[PDB]
Amino acid sequence: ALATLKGQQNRLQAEARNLERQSDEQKIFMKRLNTVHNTAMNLQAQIDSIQTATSTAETVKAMELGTKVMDSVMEQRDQIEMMTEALSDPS
């Protein structure tokens, strides 16, 4: 489906080039060319968005699989610090 979507966008480009050639001939269709280009651009945006979402989903799923004493030390250090400071104290 993705490959055929790319091919159909290429077909939209072909129709657009044919339509601009026809418009040049008529000057010597613009609405049709505009809508063909809009179709191509919308499908391009769709494929870009889906690719971005798929890559984001894959990487975030991998990272989500990846992600899937204080009291004693503080008290002893504080009291010992106080006592040793009192020791050093020559006041």
Contact set with its own copies (CB under 8 A): 1-2, 4-5, 7-8, 11, 15, 31, 35, 38, 41-43, 45-70, 72-74, 76-78, 80-81, 83-84, 86-89, 91
Residue 29 CB partners (closer than 8 Å, separation 6+):
19, 22, 23
CB of 44 to its own copies, least distance (A): 10
CB of 13 to its own copies, least distance (A): 14
3-state helix, strand, coil in the chain (%, to 5): 90, 0, 10
